[PDB]
Amino acid sequence: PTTTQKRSYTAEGKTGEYLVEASTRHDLNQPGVKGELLTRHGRFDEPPVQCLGTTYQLTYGRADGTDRRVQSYLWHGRKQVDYFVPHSTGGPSTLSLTARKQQEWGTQGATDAYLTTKM
Amino acid sequence: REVISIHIGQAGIQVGNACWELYCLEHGIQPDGQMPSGGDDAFNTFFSETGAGKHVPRCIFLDLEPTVVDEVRTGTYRQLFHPEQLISGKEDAANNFARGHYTIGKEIVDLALDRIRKLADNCTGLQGFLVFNAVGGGTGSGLGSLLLERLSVDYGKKSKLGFTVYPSPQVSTAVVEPYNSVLSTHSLLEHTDVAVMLDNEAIYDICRRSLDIERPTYTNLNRLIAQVISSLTASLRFDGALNVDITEFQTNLVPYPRIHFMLSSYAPIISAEKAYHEQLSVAEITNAAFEPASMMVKCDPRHGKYMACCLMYRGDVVPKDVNASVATIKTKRTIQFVDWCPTGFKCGINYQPPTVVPGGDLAKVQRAVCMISNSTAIGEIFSRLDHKFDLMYAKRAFVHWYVGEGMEEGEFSEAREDLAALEKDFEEVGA
Amino acid sequence: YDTVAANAVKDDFKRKGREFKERASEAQMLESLYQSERQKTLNAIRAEEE
Amino acid sequence: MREIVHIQGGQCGNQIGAKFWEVVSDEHGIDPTGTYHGDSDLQLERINVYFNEATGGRYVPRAILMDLEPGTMDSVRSGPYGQIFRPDNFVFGQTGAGNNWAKGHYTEGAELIDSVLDVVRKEAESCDCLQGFQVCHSLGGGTGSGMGTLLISKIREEYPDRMMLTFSVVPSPKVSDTVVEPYNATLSVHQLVENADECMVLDNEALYDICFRTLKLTTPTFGDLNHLISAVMSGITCCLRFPGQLNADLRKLAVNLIPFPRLHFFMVGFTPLTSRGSQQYRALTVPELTQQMWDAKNMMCAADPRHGRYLTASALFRGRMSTKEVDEQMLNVQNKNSSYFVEWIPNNVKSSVCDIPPKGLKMSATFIGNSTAIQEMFKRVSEQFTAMFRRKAFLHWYTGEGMDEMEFTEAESNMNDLVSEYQQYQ
Amino acid sequence: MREIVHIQGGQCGNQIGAKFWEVVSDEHGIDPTGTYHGDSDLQLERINVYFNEATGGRYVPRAILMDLEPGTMDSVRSGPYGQIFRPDNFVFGQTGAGNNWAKGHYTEGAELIDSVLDVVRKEAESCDCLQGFQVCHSLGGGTGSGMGTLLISKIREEYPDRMMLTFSVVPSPKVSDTVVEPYNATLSVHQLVENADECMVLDNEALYDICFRTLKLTTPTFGDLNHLISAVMSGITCCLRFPGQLNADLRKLAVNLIPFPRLHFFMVGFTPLTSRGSQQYRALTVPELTQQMWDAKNMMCAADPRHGRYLTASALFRGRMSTKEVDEQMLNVQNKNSSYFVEWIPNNVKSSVCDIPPKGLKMSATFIGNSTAIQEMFKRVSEQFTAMFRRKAFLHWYTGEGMDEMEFTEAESNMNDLVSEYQQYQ
Amino acid sequence: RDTTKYNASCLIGNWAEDRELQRAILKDMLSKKGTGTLKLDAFRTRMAAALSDLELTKVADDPYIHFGDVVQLVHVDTGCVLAGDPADADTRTGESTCAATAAPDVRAPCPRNSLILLPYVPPKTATALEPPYDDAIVHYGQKVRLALHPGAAGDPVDSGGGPRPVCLFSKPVSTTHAARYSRQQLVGFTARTDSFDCVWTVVTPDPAQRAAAEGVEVAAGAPVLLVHCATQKPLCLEAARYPNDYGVELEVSARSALGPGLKLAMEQMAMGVQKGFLPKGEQTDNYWTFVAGSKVEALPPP
Numbered sequence A: 001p002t003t004t005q006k007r008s009y010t011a012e013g014k015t016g017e018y019l020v021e022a023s024t025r026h027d028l029n030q031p032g033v034k035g036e037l038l039t040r041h042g043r044f045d046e047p048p049v050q051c052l053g054t055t056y057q058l059t060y061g062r063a064d065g066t067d068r069r070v071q072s073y074l075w076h077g078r079k080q081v082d083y084f085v086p087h088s089t090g091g092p093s094t095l096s097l098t099a100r101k102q103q104e105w106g107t108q109g110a111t112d113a114y115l116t117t118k119m
Numbered sequence B: 001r002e003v004i005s006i007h008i009g010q011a012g013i014q015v016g017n018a019c020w021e022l023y024c025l026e027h028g029i030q031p032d033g034q035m036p037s038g039g040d041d042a043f044n045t046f047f048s049e050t051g052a053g054k055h056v057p058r059c060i061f062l063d064l065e066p067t068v069v070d071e072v073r074t075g076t077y078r079q080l081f082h083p084e085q086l087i088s089g090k091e092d093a094a095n096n097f098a099r100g101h102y103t104i105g106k107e108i109v110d111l112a113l114d115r116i117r118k119l120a121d122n123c124t125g126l127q128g129f130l131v132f133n134a135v136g137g138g139t140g141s142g143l144g145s146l147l148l149e150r151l152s153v154d155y156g157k158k159s160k161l162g163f164t165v166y167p168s169p170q171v172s173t174a175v176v177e178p179y180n181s182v183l184s185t186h187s188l189l190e191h192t193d194v195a196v197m198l199d200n201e202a203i204y205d206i207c208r209r210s211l212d213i214e215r216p217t218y219t220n221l222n223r224l225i226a227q228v229i230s231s232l233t234a235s236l237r238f239d240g241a242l243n244v245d246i247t248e249f250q251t252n253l254v255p256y257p258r259i260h261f262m263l264s265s266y267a268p269i270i271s272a273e274k275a276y277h278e279q280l281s282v283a284e285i286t287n288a289a290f291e292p293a294s295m296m297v298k299c300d301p302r303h304g305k306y307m308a309c310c311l312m313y314r315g316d317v318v319p320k321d322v323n324a325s326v327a328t329i330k331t332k333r334t335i336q337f338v339d340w341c342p343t344g345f346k347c348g349i350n351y352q353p354p355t356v357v358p359g360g361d362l363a364k365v366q367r368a369v370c371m372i373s374n375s376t377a378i379g380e381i382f383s384r385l386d387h388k389f390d391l392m393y394a395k396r397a398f399v400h401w402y403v404g405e406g407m408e409e410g411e412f413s414e415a416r417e418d419l420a421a422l423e424k425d426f427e428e429v430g431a
Numbered sequence C: 001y002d003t004v005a006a007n008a009v010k011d012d013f014k015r016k017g018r019e020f021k022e023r024a025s026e027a028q029m030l031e032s033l034y035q036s037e038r039q040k041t042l043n044a045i046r047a048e049e050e
Numbered sequence D, E: 001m002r003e004i005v006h007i008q009g010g011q012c013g014n015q016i017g018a019k020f021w022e023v024v025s026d027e028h029g030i031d032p033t034g035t036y037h038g039d040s041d042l043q044l045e046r047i048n049v050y051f052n053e054a055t056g057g058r059y060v061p062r063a064i065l066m067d068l069e070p071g072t073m074d075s076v077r078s079g080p081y082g083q084i085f086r087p088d089n090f091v092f093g094q095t096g097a098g099n100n101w102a103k104g105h106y107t108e109g110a111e112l113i114d115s116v117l118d119v120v121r122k123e124a125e126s127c128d129c130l131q132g133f134q135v136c137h138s139l140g141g142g143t144g145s146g147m148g149t150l151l152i153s154k155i156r157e158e159y160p161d162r163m164m165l166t167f168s169v170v171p172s173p174k175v176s177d178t179v180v181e182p183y184n185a186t187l188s189v190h191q192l193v194e195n196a197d198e199c200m201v202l203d204n205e206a207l208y209d210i211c212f213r214t215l216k217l218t219t220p221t222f223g224d225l226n227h228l229i230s231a232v233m234s235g236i237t238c239c240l241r242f243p244g245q246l247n248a249d250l251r252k253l254a255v256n257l258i259p260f261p262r263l264h265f266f267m268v269g270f271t272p273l274t275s276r277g278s279q280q281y282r283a284l285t286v287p288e289l290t291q292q293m294w295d296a297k298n299m300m301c302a303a304d305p306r307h308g309r310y311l312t313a314s315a316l317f318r319g320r321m322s323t324k325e326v327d328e329q330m331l332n333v334q335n336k337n338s339s340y341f342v343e344w345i346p347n348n349v350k351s352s353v354c355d356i357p358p359k360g361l362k363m364s365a366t367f368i369g370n371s372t373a374i375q376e377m378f379k380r381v382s383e384q385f386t387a388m389f390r391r392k393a394f395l396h397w398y399t400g401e402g403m404d405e406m407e408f409t410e411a412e413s414n415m416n417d418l419v420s421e422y423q424q425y426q
Numbered sequence F: 001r002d003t004t005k006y007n008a009s010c011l012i013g014n015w016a017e018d019r020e021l022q023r024a025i026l027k028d029m030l031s032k033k034g035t036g037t038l039k040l041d042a043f044r045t046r047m048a049a050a051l052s053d054l055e056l057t058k059v060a061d062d063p064y065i066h067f068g069d070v071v072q073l074v075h076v077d078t079g080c081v082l083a084g085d086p087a088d089a090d091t092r093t094g095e096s097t098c099a100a101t102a103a104p105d106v107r108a109p110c111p112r113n114s115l116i117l118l119p120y121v122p123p124k125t126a127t128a129l130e131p132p133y134d135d136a137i138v139h140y141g142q143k144v145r146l147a148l149h150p151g152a153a154g155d156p157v158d159s160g161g162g163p164r165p166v167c168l169f170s171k172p173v174s175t176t177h178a179a180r181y182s183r184q185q186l187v188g189f190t191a192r193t194d195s196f197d198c199v200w201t202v203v204t205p206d207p208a209q210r211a212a213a214e215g216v217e218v219a220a221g222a223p224v225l226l227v228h229c230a231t232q233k234p235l236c237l238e239a240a241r242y243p244n245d246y247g248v249e250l251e252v253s254a255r256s257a258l259g260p261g262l263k264l265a266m267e268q269m270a271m272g273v274q275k276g277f278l279p280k281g282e283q284t285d286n287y288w289t290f291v292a293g294s295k296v297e298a299l300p301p302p
């Protein structure tokens, strides 16, 4: 006959692999879906529709090549015009600022230590 | 953030014997003191790390009989506990509050205190103390209250979460437990901050009904008590959606400085095959946490009115369904709440589901609820105990023992009238 | 301040762990799709051999 | 140029801020490492409002995150877009208040507020022309509500001329987390009526039934709610960040919406929000946006606006649209439901249009209404506060730290007087 | 051309000097084998200030290490950078002083000073046009302070027209190593005020404070503090070694910071000092350097200057910088906090710019402030000296050696009236 | 009230809605998979390039290691060859520095593990008398630099080591440049190969032997010390855990692992005794052995 405490607390159930099986850490991830996917409107096979054009640059600068009309660039209910509303105006006329600041970041990254200012 | 635990008496240290098994399982620590094979702080609140791959618990076992303590020293967890932390007197208190409070306490408590001081010194972000004792005995009652007094005069502002094993109305394993329970309560009142009661009849009925085990020992009781303790410290241990610390029970559950006595409940208590049976959702367990057939203290809250409730949730639970369930609870009328407190719930959520001990009777559940509530059914309980106290005291039975240890009738009388004042206070606030 | 530094190390450990867990979680969904289609073709084969 | 300094307080504030800086970083095209990788230069010209050039394209946010428990700081540095916050901006205590407004306003603040004031100072003079401050926090907690309102008071007595937006969640009875929600909420709103410039009232009950009815989710966890609030905060600030046909900054919105100095508690909406099973059903046009905007089930507060009147309102439109359709839609929604608007102010609706819709959408709109149905929410809180204080319940945890009872009496008088004046102007 | 001779005394002096020569040899690219291997020819032109060509480009430093226990010298020659010092320069006694100023100034100086004076006089006359001497030593130990002060006495007796720096660490009560700290410190200070040209007071208390708060370091051993002190010493002599837009050598700094011949106890700070986790999240702008430079918790002494007035101040900048932003930032910090500056001197801030940054950095700074907050420290030491001398503790190890009691009275009186004249000029 | 939940497959409740939400979620993963921009497949190609079957070569039959062959570097005490990932280089504005650690788990000859010896030629300004060797073999006390095989991209070349080579360097302990987890000189693979910092020296461990063995051909299996030639400080195993992607490695830094046994340097210097002229011996963690290649194959010149 053995003592009650030793009849209950033993080493068979522990320390082999069950510790690994019981240290799951299920509390860590608990993944949510995402933030954007709840609010996105549009088909999901395509990238999100980012509009990076403003009415001034679109009309007064005539960013789009073909200057049709002021109200053509606005969003209407009708597909008759919604097909031809432009989303993004790509060109150096926009990218001049990133060109400048990327030149600046490049000259920040690549520097010579031993260049006195006078010389 | 760290918390240390002290176990007093013969019940406290067996409860701890279950509790630390559960903790080593939950943090993946071998019974000989180290993990098999990083950079995880989740264990830090319960186990300190020493030397090379060695984790020693932040608890102090202490008892006056060396039997159970060196039984632990010879048990499975020899390398785990610190040789100094287990503390063992030479002879018991023997169901005698005065003997455990004046004779042997005066020489054991100083060692215990200059030991717990070094524990707190090695600790860094101490949340507070939590004590495990039973007031029906001599050691845990007398030296329990003595160490509580001295802890309060040393630190005071740090919370002292006290899990106390009160005696049952009809099931009794002693004779002078009325005297001892009264004398312990008389100091528990103004030294404990959040005192949680754990009976034995209620847990026996739980193991009979839910776990359908028919001939239970103390091991099963202590195992599910450890389940409850771990479920209420899971918020400190792990990162959930809405965590609640040790001070939250002090804030949200103690409306008046002498009303801190909490009924506790746990759900779902389910065995292996019934796990396969039942579809575990949140509404049925939030309901199950409120029937008297699932409270850890045998009393009827239908006769009482609630003051506050706190609900720790563990596992795959989101706030949506718990919100819906507590709304259904509030709109039900079978249970009731004090008119003056109009918002009597406090939720807390932690992501990790409770673990299962090999050889245990509980099954792997997806989610669990630990409810800690306040009511006046406890004011009923104290009167039920008061009656049987005065019955014995009228004839001065068993008093010669205490007065031979050194006390007098003054303590008996003042504790009796203090319990009476407490009765009046509960009957006043249940307005 | 010393404890702040001690946490500053574990933060990097956590970052690497989380990256790894995410990169495994994606392959989990990949394998779920694979197993769905595999069971489909399995039942298709079982049907025609009878 | 015009600068917004963002402040996050408490657990709710930290998590909302995390999703907020995720969305803003998306809109400016900065990758989670901290470098610019967008396409156009409409994004580059207005990043100084929310970020700072460190060096070599390293744009770090101008945010101050404060709390008292490391649990939030770990969750912040865990997820992506958690590596871009400046380590010096993690001002962070160690004890933890935990649902005690007095610990959040007298004890822990007394040693933490100086350090966060040092960081907030250094952050405010690092930029030149403040537009103001924008702080997201809670009202039920301790380390968010008490600590935040103390910081609000401190910064409002130092910088009296800058704007101030406070995105504060409010407790609801049906969705009630803690027990001392009233004891904290009333004292916090009592501080906000004298320090904040305008408050945007949020709550979890309205966010939940929005995710039930409109968004039609199964488990609307906190990640989705925080993103809805994130979409709102980005929508309210879009006017500074992008050029548009009719710009309207924060102070321009404040003067168009605040008729009286104590009437500055708004209710907020966001459009469009539709279920993913019904995305293709709806066109993208102003009438469809407006019908969803003025609905009572799209407000982000637990106040039926048809139970009162609108004093003023505002609609911030994003996207290439026609202003006639904008103005005629406002005129129709004001003339049809003319009983719901006050009579002694004509043209109760302010409008604005910017040219950049948020990423993934074609056209969006944000509603900000100063209605008088907000007194129903404050009565709902004050009636619970009068219940507990009469019995002096739960009170000793507060009084045992520096607070007295008359402070609670002042909170009662202010709330009763505020709902009195809203009821007056109805 | 203009030459600097280095002199190190004591354990603190030997370990500071070891790290100092490691940094300077790094700046001029010379390896611990003794050979030049750098790339830019800007580094060859000004090594004669510190080295001497021996054979095949062997450049040995112009330094003299002195102490009384071989323990420090073994640590010097043990590791790297131990093979560059000439063995003749290891002038070395064998008995030991042991925290006894009397031993270090009368009984052990008597037989060590002949040898060091031979070595220093030979190493000084070897180069043509001395700029001055440099001394690094401690004020707690005996062979550092005792031998240091005796050597200063004999040197200023011989070569009076050359400059002389003294980097001295003063013992703090919060970081207090020894017990006879006051008895050494006060006797050394009484000697320094009469013979040293100018002194720059370091302290380990402020250095530990910096490695905790700003650098955010895990285990700050003495190697780190030695690296900080070395960064100071390289910064103070940068302008001799590299061409700049506005040069300022030691004599130029001394004349612009010492208004009265006894007010030569400067306080030092260094900039920039940021943790490596916070290095990417910052820019490098002159305000970014000035904010940290004039900060109170950045001084390398245990005296908050906000308790006093800046008599004069000096700023030494390194890197390709814009002089306009340098001058206007000095002007703004002078005009905003107009209470911390004295009245009877306008333009209290001498400034200088060098064009070569310290290795690994883009742009740095070095602060030298002559304040009247230093009399906090002298009082903090003098009160302990009075507390001991009232009851003659530890006195006999001094009195029974040749030293008398009147030396203690004059030391305390000169300590007292120095503090009184600093207090008078505030 | 409350009713039971069901799987997505069965149609009940808002089955349409959860099914559609899932449809969109999965469509996103598919589109990204087509593009190739997922986190998963982002570094799979990097793993293919960084861990590939590599065979070490020797330029000649002789056992001594020769300049320009592909070699390994391994710690004698515990194996754990040294290797630096090209990715996860520190991010700053002017810094191309890339961290290098010691991998215990990966010891098989791989592209990233392999070092390639490059001869160092002193510039004209440098004032250093150098023993002249004509043969291509490497000896003791001879300046040498070590680059690593191109694990990022490109093809190896005899001395260029790819179009842009990254060589072993270490800078003294400043506020900027310090090992991440301990306070010693960091050791990385910078792209500025022409700087003097990248040069290294191979010295026999015993202090007494080295003077006599000043110039002799170095064998493969012999244990030797790698000392930074600009700081004269050996290479050491830091014994601190390092969490990079490939595995949990050990930090590598440059310290002089000296046993704290004092030597009476000053007394012996004054006496002039022979024993005086010696640096204190280094500890067992400084020892490194080159692992040479059995087969013979010269790499193509630039």
Ligand SMILES: Nc1nc2c(ncn2[C@@H]2O[C@H](COP(=O)(O)OP(=O)(O)OP(=O)(O)O)[C@@H](O)[C@H]2O)c(=O)[nH]1
Pocket (backbone or CB within 6 Å): B008, B009, B010, B011, B012, B014, B015, B064, B092, B093, B094, B095, B096, B134, B136, B137, B138, B139, B140, B141, B165, B167, B173, B174, B199, B200, B218, B219, B221, B222
């Ligand atoms: N639930 C539970 N109760 C226990 C356990 N062990 C003891 N008890 C209770 O403890 C009460 C008596 O106190 P004990 O702990 O046995 O003895 P003591 O507190 O040390 O006092 P002394 O016997 O005088 O030393 C009994 O009524 C039991 O119900 C246990 O393991 N589980």
Ligand SMILES: Nc1nc2c(ncn2[C@@H]2O[C@H](COP(=O)(O)OP(=O)(O)O)[C@@H](O)[C@H]2O)c(=O)[nH]1
Pocket (backbone or CB within 6 Å): D009, D010, D011, D012, D015, D016, D098, D099, D138, D140, D141, D142, D143, D144, D145, D169, D177, D178, D204, D222, D223, D225, D226
């Ligand atoms: N909307 C939203 N609310 C939250 C989130 N996290 C917590 N909360 C709310 O915060 C309130 C409690 O705030 P609390 O954590 O106590 O604030 P603190 O303790 O002072 O930081 C609860 O009512 C929650 O509903 C979140 O991610 N989103």
Ligand SMILES: Nc1nc2c(ncn2[C@@H]2O[C@H](COP(=O)(O)OP(=O)(O)O)[C@@H](O)[C@H]2O)c(=O)[nH]1
Pocket (backbone or CB within 6 Å): E009, E010, E011, E012, E015, E016, E067, E098, E099, E138, E140, E141, E142, E143, E144, E145, E169, E171, E176, E177, E178, E204, E222, E225, E226
């Ligand atoms: N900063 C710094 N202080 C030191 C160092 N070594 C010693 N000290 C300080 O110097 C004081 C004692 O100097 P001491 O060794 O007695 O000088 P010595 O005996 O004359 O050589 C103590 O307060 C130490 O803190 C060092 O390497 N760096």
Ligand SMILES: [Mg+2]
Pocket (backbone or CB within 6 Å): B009, B010, B092, B093, B094, B137, B138, B139
């Ligand atoms: Mg007992």
